[model samples]
Target: LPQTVRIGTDTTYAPFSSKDAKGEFIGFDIDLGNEMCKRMQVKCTWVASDFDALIPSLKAKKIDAIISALSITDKRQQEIAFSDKLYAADSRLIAAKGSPIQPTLESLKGKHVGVLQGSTQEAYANDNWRTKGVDVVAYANQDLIYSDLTAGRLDAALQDEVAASEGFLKQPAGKEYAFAGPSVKDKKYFGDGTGVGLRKDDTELKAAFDKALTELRQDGTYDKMAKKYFDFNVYGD
Candidate 1:
């Protein structure tokens, strides 16, 4: 194995991956990735990039692994390999309190909704709503979506349920916002869960990551890291 692993992550999604005030990466994904690297006996460097660029950067050899909140969908599986599941991720819509919004085409019609570019939520909404006339806008990062939503430029925002909940709804900026409806579910778009993305040809690296993840799960390291950001179980069934 390489002595150092270059890991790519989109740091705009808080609680999963984000930069702290000191401009250092901090969050569940960072902790988990750092621990996994330690277990694998390899130095790891986290490279921050836009969510949409993580895969391209990996394919181009700019990074060896992607530890972002990347979903493990069939479409993605066809392009690259992923480690065993890291955690569950479900999409949801959020809007101003009492907005009467829902995650439905009819409800969002003529409404400007925001989603992170290159996200499963964007893919789902673009296919099911944007093509049908709903105004679905894609942003470069999650922060932009929340900003536009709060600024009245967007009618609603769609993102990972946990991110929208803990990253926004629980923050002071989201005081006037609430989840618009239930979590969106569609295996084809949202996938089974999140995982570490690797090049399809990196079989050895994949095995190392999977083994480290299994050990972390058995040793309670996974739970310890998750508990820092969540109250309920973030590792879904």
Candidate 2:
């Protein structure tokens, strides 16, 4: 690792990381990233990377760390190491409020579903819904899906509850929508919380982040920032 760590972030996954009106990247992840690097006494640089390609770019040595709300999943854990979770996310589904559909496998049948590409929501929709005749559409980014969804192109969209709650449901267009299902933290798809991702063999980098994470959790800094991105404390049980 260099004196300054280069971190990869997705530019559209608010309230985690998204571009501002002036097109500058800003969000909870950017703020927390700066704080984490400061605590670790390392200079930091941010790189805009597509969310789906983040891990592939890391393996190709294009960045030093990834902290883009990527979950700590068993499948990913097999390829890249990760720090202890800094945030937790639960799976959720959204539909027009008062719509008869309630987001169950049967309820969603024959209806169109929207999800971000290269996401666990994509996995769940593919493994469960698509296998049973539900229509699913994948988008390159979250904003597009919402745009299409609000335009009545899709019936429902399922994703991480944290992002959906903080980034969308609270936004202007999300006014007519509401989460309609029990939160699902499926081990096979939703994964276990959110962690800092690093190269698989970079044991030292993973350890460094794990150490910083421990301090952040105990210091209440995590709580202060987390509350900005989500209503519920999805951290420890």
Candidate 3:
């Protein structure tokens, strides 16, 4: 092993990364991260950190990479680098059952939308919703948003469809809130798909990750991981 690689993640967000039945931190990211490490032939270490702080943690030399299903965005590009896109998708707006909100942008013109404080989805929502005079409320974590949204503190919420579907909707509380419409993908804010966050100058490390991820994409490992979370091959769909 070249070195024991450390990866930082927003442990509270899911169904990308969260505690499992055994109380171990687990999810789609964990599954894929473990596979990535195996292919890279390195020892993997997980560092639990806040979503907004993952980049700072990397700059501070706390972790070698970030593997928490963090989305690639232009803002992130200013301070860090990313690997090839893995599991690509768009952001969704959701509301509780019986709510009179329509799935159109006009319907949510001034509605209160909840978002995780530090995630890319937060930035995306703020730019589109808040700037347009819609109320954008930030949550410390996804669970907080779900709690308040279900209680009517928010008119709707913004998040990845996969997360909303697999993590939230699968649960009892999330059952009340369903996806509103086709997700809105921001090319400027959301960028491509999710990737491993890396330091800008780390060429060798980046190369290794790129190669490993490409192999997974070419082989069937990436497809397997995607299917574990969503319908129709997420990689190709």
Candidate 4:
């Protein structure tokens, strides 16, 4: 592991990477990264940035790595590098409880659905649904998407399953909402799996993370940490 590492993350998404009441950054990503650093004997710093800025900033060398829930997709692979699959979770559409919403263009026709701008969900929505008559809306962040979904400004919302569950669906304001469709797993859009984003040229750094991640998994540490947040397997087979 490197002597010092900076991990970039979008702190607005709760249960993954978000600020606590005392203004401290804490979440699943933070804990997982911290554990990796512990085993690797490296000092890690969590740099809370925006979701859209995470990649650009990483490429500009503003941060060493991005520990966000960034997926390993072909489009993204062309721009940067990725660690071994960190945590794998599917994407889904959420709507009012008992909604008939489905992850199909026909089901969403004429309906407004909100997704985070520049996110995989946004790309997927625009590519597959919007072109088919679904009114796909983009917001700067997940909070805004959830807000509109709550105010009836949006008919539904799409996001990572884990994030939607922990950040919104499990919360009081989101209690009336429920996932309305099966999980999305398109390698063309949603990507291979979630992983740590690194610079394309940073082969050594990526290797270090890959090794550390494997060790965590082999030692049962990964499952222990993941279980604290998700009851199901977030780590893909």
- Clashing residue pair totals per candidate (backbone < 3 A): 0, 0, 0, 0
Which is the leading candidate under lDDT?
Answer: 1
Candidate 2 overall Cα lDDT vs. reference? 0.84
Segments in model 1 whose C-alpha atoms lie over 4 Å from true places: none
Model 4 per-residue lDDT tens digits across residues 20-88: 899898888888788877777799988987688999999998899998889889999999999988888
The digit string of per-residue lDDT tens for model 3 on 117-232 reads: 87777887777668887788998778788888888888888877778877888888887777776687568877777889999998888888888888887888887787766776
Number of the candidate with higher lDDT, 3 or 4: 4
Deviation in Å, model 3, residue 52 alpha carbon:
0.8
Worst 10 residues of 4 by lDDT: 32-41
* TM-score for each candidate, following the candidate numbering: 0.99, 0.94, 0.91, 0.95
lDDT of each: 0.94, 0.84, 0.80, 0.88
> Which residue pairs clash in candidate 1?
none
Per-residue accuracy of model 2 over 140-202 as CA lDDT, tens digit each: 888887888799998989887878877888899899998877776578777888888998788
Instruction: Tell me the TM-score of model 4.
Output: 0.95
Top-TM-score candidate index: 1
User: Considering TM-score, where higher is better, how would the candidates rank from best to worst?
Assistant: 1, 4, 2, 3
Q: What is residue 161's positional error in candidate 2, in angstroms?
A: 0.6
Global local distance difference test of model 3: 0.80
Any residue pairs clashing in model 4, and if so which?
none
62-174: candidate 1 lDDT, tens digit per residue? 99999998999999999999999999999999999999999999999999999999999999999999999999999999999999999999999989999988999999989
